[PDB]
Design an enzyme around this catalytic site. Structure first.
Site, PDB file in Angstrom:
ATOM      1  N   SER A  41       5.806   1.749  13.566  1.00  0.00           N
ATOM      2  CA  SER A  41       4.892   1.434  12.482  1.00  0.00           C
ATOM      3  C   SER A  41       3.940   0.343  12.931  1.00  0.00           C
ATOM      4  CB  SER A  41       5.652   0.981  11.237  1.00  0.00           C
ATOM      5  OG  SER A  41       6.337  -0.233  11.481  1.00  0.00           O
TER       6      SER A  41
ATOM      7  N   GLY B  63       3.898  -4.158  11.826  1.00  0.00           N
ATOM      8  CA  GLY B  63       5.083  -4.900  12.191  1.00  0.00           C
ATOM      9  C   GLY B  63       4.989  -5.444  13.602  1.00  0.00           C
TER      10      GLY B  63
ATOM     11  N   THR C  32       1.764  -4.667   2.725  1.00  0.00           N
ATOM     12  CA  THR C  32       2.870  -5.600   2.594  1.00  0.00           C
ATOM     13  C   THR C  32       2.808  -6.697   3.650  1.00  0.00           C
ATOM     14  OG1 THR C  32       4.351  -4.314   3.998  1.00  0.00           O
ATOM     15  CG2 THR C  32       4.252  -3.737   1.668  1.00  0.00           C
TER      16      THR C  32
ATOM     17  N   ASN D  66       1.059   5.397   3.594  1.00  0.00           N
ATOM     18  CA  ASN D  66       1.964   5.343   2.454  1.00  0.00           C
ATOM     19  C   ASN D  66       1.239   5.613   1.143  1.00  0.00           C
ATOM     20  OD1 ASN D  66       4.094   4.820   4.125  1.00  0.00           O
ATOM     21  ND2 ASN D  66       4.194   2.634   3.676  1.00  0.00           N
TER      22      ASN D  66
ATOM     23  N   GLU E 212       2.182  23.435  24.321  1.00  0.00           N
ATOM     24  CA  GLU E 212       1.134  24.274  23.752  1.00  0.00           C
ATOM     25  C   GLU E 212       0.324  23.515  22.711  1.00  0.00           C
ATOM     26  OE1 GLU E 212       3.158  28.713  24.275  1.00  0.00           O
ATOM     27  OE2 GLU E 212       1.495  28.337  22.909  1.00  0.00           O
TER      28      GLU E 212
HETATM   29  N1  LIG Z   1       6.738   5.192   5.318  1.00  0.00           N
HETATM   30  C1  LIG Z   1       7.516   4.133   5.472  1.00  0.00           C
HETATM   31  N2  LIG Z   1       6.966   2.943   5.877  1.00  0.00           N
HETATM   32  C2  LIG Z   1       7.746   1.856   6.038  1.00  0.00           C
HETATM   33  C3  LIG Z   1       9.098   1.935   5.795  1.00  0.00           C
HETATM   34  N3  LIG Z   1       9.633   0.727   6.026  1.00  0.00           N
HETATM   35  C4  LIG Z   1       8.656  -0.114   6.415  1.00  0.00           C
HETATM   36  N4  LIG Z   1       7.477   0.570   6.416  1.00  0.00           N
HETATM   37  C5  LIG Z   1       6.167   0.021   6.792  1.00  0.00           C
HETATM   38  O1  LIG Z   1       6.337  -0.865   7.878  1.00  0.00           O
HETATM   39  C6  LIG Z   1       5.524  -2.004   7.736  1.00  0.00           C
HETATM   40  C7  LIG Z   1       6.267  -3.227   8.254  1.00  0.00           C
HETATM   41  O2  LIG Z   1       6.436  -3.099   9.642  1.00  0.00           O
HETATM   42  P1  LIG Z   1       7.884  -2.961  10.316  1.00  0.00           P
HETATM   43  O3  LIG Z   1       7.787  -2.183  11.599  1.00  0.00           O
HETATM   44  O4  LIG Z   1       8.852  -2.322   9.361  1.00  0.00           O
HETATM   45  O5  LIG Z   1       8.346  -4.454  10.649  1.00  0.00           O
HETATM   46  P2  LIG Z   1       9.671  -4.646  11.524  1.00  0.00           P
HETATM   47  O6  LIG Z   1      10.145  -3.322  12.053  1.00  0.00           O
HETATM   48  O7  LIG Z   1      10.739  -5.343  10.716  1.00  0.00           O
HETATM   49  O8  LIG Z   1       9.214  -5.582  12.738  1.00  0.00           O
HETATM   50  P3  LIG Z   1       8.694  -7.061  12.407  1.00  0.00           P
HETATM   51  O9  LIG Z   1       7.304  -6.999  11.834  1.00  0.00           O
HETATM   52  O10 LIG Z   1       8.679  -7.877  13.666  1.00  0.00           O
HETATM   53  O11 LIG Z   1       9.626  -7.679  11.399  1.00  0.00           O
HETATM   54  C8  LIG Z   1       5.182  -2.112   6.266  1.00  0.00           C
HETATM   55  O12 LIG Z   1       3.805  -2.330   6.090  1.00  0.00           O
HETATM   56  C9  LIG Z   1       5.570  -0.789   5.653  1.00  0.00           C
HETATM   57  O13 LIG Z   1       4.439  -0.181   5.075  1.00  0.00           O
HETATM   58  C10 LIG Z   1       9.657   3.127   5.385  1.00  0.00           C
HETATM   59  O14 LIG Z   1      10.860   3.190   5.168  1.00  0.00           O
HETATM   60  N5  LIG Z   1       8.862   4.232   5.223  1.00  0.00           N
END
Ligand SMILES: Nc1nc2c(ncn2[C@@H]2O[C@H](COP(=O)(O)OP(=O)(O)OP(=O)(O)O)[C@@H](O)[C@H]2O)c(=O)[nH]1
Ligand SMILES: CC(=O)O[C@H]1C(=O)[C@@]2(C)[C@H]([C@H](OC(=O)c3ccccc3)[C@]3(O)C[C@H](OC(=O)[C@H](O)[C@@H](NC(=O)c4ccccc4)c4ccccc4)C(C)=C1C3(C)C)[C@]1(OC(C)=O)CO[C@@H]1C[C@@H]2O
Ligand SMILES: Nc1ncnc2c1ncn2[C@@H]1O[C@H](COP(=O)(O)OP(=O)(O)NP(=O)(O)O)[C@@H](O)[C@H]1O
Ligand SMILES: Nc1nc2c(ncn2[C@@H]2O[C@H](COP(=O)(O)OP(=O)(O)O)[C@@H](O)[C@H]2O)c(=O)[nH]1
Ligand SMILES: [Mg+2]
Lengths: 385, 433, 451
Positions: free
Chosen positions: C140, C143, C179, C206, C254
């Site tokens: 994602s 993060g 978020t 999302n 493919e």
């Molecule tokens: N679609 C979806 N998005 C998610 C979910 N959980 C977190 N996210 C997205 O992930 C983003 C946060 O980044 P993350 O990769 O989860 O953060 P992290 O993995 O804890 O890594 P750090 O930022 O270092 O704490 C948020 O903006 C959310 O929109 C999920 O279960 N489903």
């Protein structure tokens, strides 16, 4: 108060023994006030380019045309800034570069004392000008101090005692200062050389992948300059006092380059923080200079912010107030050391960034054809008319 | 494993720490004797954040209690949770500072600081991976302000990569229980601005206002105010202890909330508050929590957020809820009140969700705001401080303990710069000149 | 036979992994403890499909997956959850602090101290496979971990393996809701490694999935579980061709051969047509033409971007269930006549087709109806640039004043890297504008002369 006229300069040094030994290639090319640099691994897309207020080509030592001789750069910067100092206002020089690029050189010069850097030319003109000017009705005083900033802690170099940390303070009228900071008087430039060597021996240095000797801390060499007048009256007074701050900045650091852990990463992080704060204040000063110059409406006070790092905090009187600033950035000519030069140019591009562009010419045959066609058109006109 | 070391100095800090440990012990189901008599399984999963394990399945907290008079230590030991603490952590002297900052930081505290630091190092070395520290204290007093600032300085010097917090009770505008308060508040803020990563500002006046108006209590007492503050303290660090759908450590709040290093003074808050005998009328949902949370009269800082602009906001929710509701509500709050949010941060609301709500609340939320209105507090202190310093009201008590007048001035300058820096990002446009 | 490793990084990756592996276990009839009683009842078969699972002597099956994170909180749920016995104990947590929304702490400082172990486990897993197809990384943007550690891992994997494919499924930031406050820095810093190393990256939002859930499934208060289930369905439809029999099968390579014109424009969108609740599953035919038409509706896109503002460079349709080729040809012919849908002039064909026999499954306790036909569409288009432009604007509004920058440089990143990348993103935006332009009128100068 005076306009924050900041001067941005860059200079390219020649080859060293190791670079000459290898089959290295030059990548910096200059033209007017613009410098361009290429990638050895990506030679297809384009060169990157930057513009600065001064571009200095000290690459080819025996070159006679557009050579940036040391007397030339001194005339560009040091003479005007010494003139500003003698008016009673503060002066600051910042030396920046990465091991090899060639910082010390620009600041000191060769050892044979035939081609002098900024420091000897400035100091000798100061001493000589005074010695060949002082009279019964005037007195001149000069003192020197030398300190270092390491991990946001101030340490003394001239004093040989146990290197304990000192405590910065803020006299209400005179501004920031440091307690128990050794201050000494000097008579000629030999004394300054002795003190400078003694202090430079006490600086903290650590080895890394880039070089075995790399600066791990900033240094400040302050020259306190005072003029006193003896008028035809019982009231004898000090006309004014000025300070010259010659400053050595440690190079920017990247774990993608210094892979050491522990204290080494922490020192690099603190260095990067200090450099970012310095760039932040310097650019704001240039904006402050530029605004009212254009629209007459000074931007309020844009209250500049120095209480962010100790380096900009101690130098508050020199950046701000009635003062002038000038910066020189060293650059190395190895094709191998690309990203060091790229980072140096990027960080030098701040502080009144100058608009840069490229030109690119056209196929010579097409230009010859165009010139021939223009001549034919003129002659056909020479026929018509 | 994210371990937190807790410290508390002075009467106010000791009382708040006692109430806080009583609350946390209830949360994790620890008896006063120290044994575990809980019901759920998740309570022991992360007990090591705040507690150490003894021999016979007995737990002991990481509290370190500091003072310069034995009265409060005796009061805490002769209490409902007196025997839970470790006896060797009760560090104290005699003939306390006596509302004198110089006695606390330069003369009397210099003797006890070595012992306190020894205990702190002993407790810290035993942790697996220390995250940060805490410190509860009051700025209007001698022992609290002085010893707390000295401890913060020394610990920051020794451990430079961990996160230092602090919950400080600022002097109030009107209600005053000391006369030499402004000197202590100023000479202190001077250190807190330098040596701390986060500070949460508490004020007695706001808490009294909440108790009188929202909770509808007829006879508030200091236990209630400690209750509120303890609820907030528990709410802040929830995501270290329990699982959730979006976690937020102390460091994430630090990174997201602070734009520049010297702007880390926060306004805390907690929702909801039904005042009792009115629960049946109020339906508890996420929009209701968001409505009460952003209300100006809910804050505990005694600053009106409508007089400035929100640099950044953080909301930590605790319960089972939908993420769409949370995101939509934060977006609506941002849009409807666009005048009170700075324009050069495109989005300035951090959100986190935890799965385990408090003892008897289907849902709860805690608020950490960062706005320019807090400057008013500092300004008010300055407006008193100089009024007492022009004519040197009570200065000889301070210079008699070895403190040059310059130290006073070097500070009024520092706080004034803080007010100016906050004032810069306060105007709701910047152009023309 | 045809094996794929799934690598999950960050909270979002781990949770989507939970949903994906729930779906796979339900699909192949493997119990949560790893046993497969259905094979014992049958007496022998190939149900232990090697695309995702590896079989041991005792009949237990272990998935081919590698979970990674820095917070113990997320993985410890799995280690004590319903599937505690399904996974190998090697879950690769760093029992330390999190990267904390800081790309630097996840590529330069805390990111090491765990990469070597991850690469060793991946080496063992890859050695177990007898002819690999590719990788599937789930992460994602925004993060710290899912940006920095994803970048570091992709760099090392590209060095070590090189020729194997690498696909992404990533959550891009939404235009409005988010978020985090320091999201744009992380996204822009990630785009470089997303560009150079990955071979085909899919993006979702999302906000779009929330709108889809509200409009189609009539769920007014969805949570992350529903979004994760939908993404799991997408990935299952992608990979279905490797596992089950079909009339026309499409391998992972493919997709790449038919979907990316040039190396730098490998950013397609994904869509799933028959999202419909059980109550509304009646009152409707759900024929092939209906679902094919629904796949092109702008309201059903999984990314907040309008296809009507751009042009379709290429498309790929994957059908599941009771589907016959002639209806597919009729639907494609119908779509080609509409004027709202625009195709670039240099791709006259512009369609790839794949048909599979196994229909989609239903997760107990889910919210998707049981249906006989389904289609998943992957479109390579030029509309996506618009989304990037929006995020680009946000970056500038924070970088003029150097907000939140001291955290990044305090961990080992020169202020330069920030701009060195902004420029990279701007160059990419230039290419998408360049490719979508119609060929210049009679591209080869002018013709018409003697014969
Ligand atoms: N679609 C979806 N998005 C998610 C979910 N959980 C977190 N996210 C997205 O992930 C983003 C946060 O980044 P993350 O990769 O989860 O953060 P992290 O993995 O804890 O890594 P750090 O930022 O270092 O704490 C948020 O903006 C959310 O929109 C999920 O279960 N489903
Ligand atoms: C509806 C119901 O069951 O009664 C509530 C109640 O009426 C209210 C008014 C409670 C009540 O709080 C107060 O009356 C109060 C008094 C002085 C200062 C602060 C609060 C309650 O006492 C507080 C108590 O809250 C808890 O038990 C929480 O778990 C809380 N912990 C403690 O209060 C606590 C105190 C000492 C020792 C151990 C626990 C908590 C909240 C967040 C994080 C950690 C802990 C609860 C449910 C209520 C009563 C009993 C009336 C409120 O407090 C909390 C923290 O929940 C006041 O605002 C909330 C809203 C609630 O609706
Ligand atoms: N413009 C120049 N012309 C000629 N010689 C130069 C020039 N610049 C540098 N040199 C010489 O080439 C070498 C490069 O300078 P050097 O002492 O390596 O500086 P540096 O290591 O880049 N300093 P620093 O950036 O502070 O670490 C030295 O021997 C210099 O005297
Ligand atoms: N919130 C709160 N504040 C308190 C409490 N007790 C004292 N105070 C505040 O603390 C101030 C005096 O500080 P004090 O505790 O004497 O400092 P110390 O002597 O160094 O410990 C007063 O102005 C009170 O407002 C308490 O129980 N709760
Ligand atoms: Mg994380």
């Amino acid at each position: 108060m005076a306009g924050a006229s900041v001067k941005v300069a860059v200079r390219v040094r020649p080859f060293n023994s190791r670079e000459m030994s290898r089959d290295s290639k030059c990548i910096i090319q200059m033209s007017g006030s613009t410098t361009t640099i290429v990638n050895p691994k990506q030679p297809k897309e384009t060169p990157k380019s930057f513009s600065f207020d001064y571009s200095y080509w000290s690459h080819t030592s025996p070159e006679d045309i557009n050579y940036a001789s040391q007397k030339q750069v001194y005339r560009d910067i040091g003479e005007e800034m010494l003139q500003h100092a003698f008016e009673g206002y503060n002066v600051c020089i910042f030396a920046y570069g990465q091991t090899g690029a060639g910082k010390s050189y620009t600041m000191m010069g060769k050892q044979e004392k035939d081609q002098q850097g900024i420091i000897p030319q400035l100091c000798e003109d100061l001493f000589s000008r005074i010695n060949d000017t002082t009279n019964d009705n005037m007195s001149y005083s000069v003192e020197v101090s030398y300190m270092e900033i390491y991990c946001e802690r101030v340490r003394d170099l001239l004093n040989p005692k146990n290197k304990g940390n000192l405590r910065v303070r803020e006299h209400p009228l005179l501004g920031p200062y440091v307690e128990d900071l050794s201050k000494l008087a000097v008579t000629s430039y030999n004394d300054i050389q002795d003190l400078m060597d003694s202090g430079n021996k006490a600086r903290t240095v650590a080895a890394t992948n880039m070089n075995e000797t790399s600066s791990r801390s900033h240094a400040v060499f302050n020259i306190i300059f005072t003029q006193k007048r003896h008028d035809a009256e019982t009231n004898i007074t000090t006309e004014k006092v000025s300070k010259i701050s010659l400053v050595d900045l440690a190079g920017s650091e990247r774990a993608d380059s210094t892979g050491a852990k522990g204290t080494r990463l922490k020192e690099g992080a603190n260095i990067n923080k200090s450099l970012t704060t310095l760039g932040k204040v310097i650019s704001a000063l240039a904006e402050m200079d530029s605004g009212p110059n254009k629209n007459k409406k000074k931007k309020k006070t844009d209250f500049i912010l120095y209480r962010d790092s100790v380096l900009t905090w101690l130098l508050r009187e020199n950046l701000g107030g009635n003062s002038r600033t000038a910066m020189v950035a060293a650059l190395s000519p190895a094709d191998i050391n690309y990203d060091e030069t790229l980072s140096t140019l990027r960080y030098a591009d701040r502080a009144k960034q100058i608009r840069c562009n490229a030109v690119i010419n056209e196929d010579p045959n097409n230009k010859l054809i165009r010139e021939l066609k223009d001549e034919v058109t003129r002659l056909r006109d020479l026929l018509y008319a | 494993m994210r371990e937190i070391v807790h410290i508390q100095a002075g009467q106010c800090g000791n009382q708040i720490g006692a109430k806080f440990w009583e609350v946390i012990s209830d949360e994790h189901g620890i008896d006063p004797t120290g044994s575990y008599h809980g019901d759920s399984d998740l309570q022991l999963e992360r007990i090591n954040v705040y507690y150490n394990e003894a021999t016979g399945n007995k737990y002991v907290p990481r509290a370190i209690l500091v003072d310069l008079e034995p009265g409060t230590m005796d009061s805490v030991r002769s209490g409902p949770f007196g025997q839970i603490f470790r006896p060797d952590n009760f560090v104290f002297g005699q003939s306390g500072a006596g509302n004198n900052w110089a006695k606390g930081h330069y003369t009397e505290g210099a003797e006890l600081v070595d012992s306190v630091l020894d205990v702190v190092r002993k407790e810290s070395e035993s942790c697996d991976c220390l995250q940060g520290f805490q410190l509860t204290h009051s700025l209007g007093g001698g022992t609290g302000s002085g010893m707390g600032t000295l401890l913060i300085s020394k610990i920051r010097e020794e451990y430079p990569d961990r996160i230092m917090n602090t919950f400080s009770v600022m002097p109030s505008p009107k209600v005053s229980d000391t006369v030499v308060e402004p000197y202590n508040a100023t000479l202190s803020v001077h250190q807190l601005v330098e040596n701390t990563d986060e500070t949460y500002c508490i004020d007695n006046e706001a808490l009294y206002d909440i108790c009188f108006r929202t909770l509808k209590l007829t006879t508030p007492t200091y236990g209630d105010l400690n209750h509120l503050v303890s609820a907030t303290m528990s709410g802040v660090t929830t995501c270290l202890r329990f699982p959730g759908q979006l976690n937020a450590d102390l460091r994430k709040l630090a990174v997201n909330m602070v734009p520049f290093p010297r702007l880390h003074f926060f306004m805390p808050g907690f929702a909801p508050l039904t005042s009792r005998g009115s629960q049946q009328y109020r339906a508890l949902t996420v929009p209701e929590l968001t409505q009460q949370m952003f209300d100006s009269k809910n804050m505990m800082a005694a600053c009106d957020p409508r007089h400035g602009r929100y640099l950044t906001v953080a909301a930590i929710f605790r319960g089972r809820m939908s993420m769409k509701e949370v995101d939509e509500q934060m977006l609506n709050v941002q849009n409807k009140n666009s005048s009170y949010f700075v324009e050069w941060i495109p989005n300035n609301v951090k959100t986190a969700v935890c799965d385990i709500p408090p003892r008897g609340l289907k849902m709860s939320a805690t608020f950490i705001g960062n706005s320019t209105a807090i400057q008013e507090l500092f300004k008010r202190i300055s407006e008193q401080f100089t009024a007492m310093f022009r004519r040197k009201a009570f200065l000889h008590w301070y210079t008699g303990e070895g403190m040059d007048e310059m130290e006073f001035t070097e500070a009024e300058s520092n706080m004034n710069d803080l007010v100016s820096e906050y004032q810069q990002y306060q105007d709701a446009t910047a152009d023309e000149q | 036979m045809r094996e794929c490793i799934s690598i999950h990084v960050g909270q979002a990756g781990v949770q989507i992994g939970n949903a994906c592996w729930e779906l796979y276990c339900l699909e192949h009839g493997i119990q949560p403890d790893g046993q497969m009683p259905s094979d014992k009842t049958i007496g022998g078969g190939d149900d232990s499909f090697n695309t995702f699972f590896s079989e041991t002597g005792a009949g237990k099956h272990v998935p081919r997956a590698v979970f990674v994170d820095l917070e113990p909180t997320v993985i410890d749920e799995v280690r004590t959850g319903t599937y505690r016995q399904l996974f190998h104990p090697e879950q690769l947590i760093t029992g330390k602090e999190d990267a904390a929304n800081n790309y630097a702490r996840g590529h330069y400082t805390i990111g090491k101290e765990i990469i070597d172990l991850v690469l060793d486990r991946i080496r063992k897993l890859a050695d177990q496979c007898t002819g690999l197809q590719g990788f599937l990384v789930f992460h994602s943007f925004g993060g710290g971990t899912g940006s920095g550690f994803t970048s570091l891992l992709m760099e090392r994997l590209s060095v070590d393996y090189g020729k194997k494919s690498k696909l992404e499924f990533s959550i891009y930031p939404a235009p409005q809701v988010s978020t985090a406050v320091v999201e744009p820095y992380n996204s822009i810093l990630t785009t470089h490694t997303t560009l150079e190393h990955s071979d085909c990256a899919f993006m979702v939002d999302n906000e779009a999935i929330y709108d889809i859930c509200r409009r189609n499934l009539d769920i007014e208060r969805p949570t992350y579980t529903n979004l994760n289930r939908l993404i799991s369905q997408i990935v299952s439809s992608i990979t279905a061709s490797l596992r089950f029999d079909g009339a026309l099968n499409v391998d992972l390579t493919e997709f790449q051969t038919n979907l990316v014109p040039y190396p730098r424009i490998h950013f397609p969108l994904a869509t799933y047509a028959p999202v419909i609740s059980a109550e509304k599953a009646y009152h409707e035919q759900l024929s092939v033409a209906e679902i094919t038409n629904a796949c092109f509706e702008p309201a059903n896109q999984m990314v907040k971007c309008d296809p009507r503002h751009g042009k379709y460079m290429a498309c790929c349709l994957l059908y599941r269930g009771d589907v016959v080729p002639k209806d597919v040809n009729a639907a494609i012919a119908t779509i080609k006549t509409k004027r709202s849908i625009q195709f670039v002039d240099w791709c006259p064909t512009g369609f790839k087709v794949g048909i599979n026999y196994q229909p989609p499954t239903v997760v107990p306790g889910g919210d998707l109806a049981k249906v006989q036909r389904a289609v998943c569409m992957l479109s390579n288009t030029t509309a996506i640039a618009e989304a990037w432009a929006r995020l680009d604007h946000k970056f500038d509004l924070m970088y003029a004043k150097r907000a939140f920058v001291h955290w990044y440089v305090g961990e080992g990143m020169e202020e330069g890297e920030f701009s060195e990348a902004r420029e990279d993103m701007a160059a990419l935006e230039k290419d998408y504008e360049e490719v979508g332009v119609d060929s210049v009128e009679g591209e080869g100068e002018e013709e018409g002369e003697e014969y």
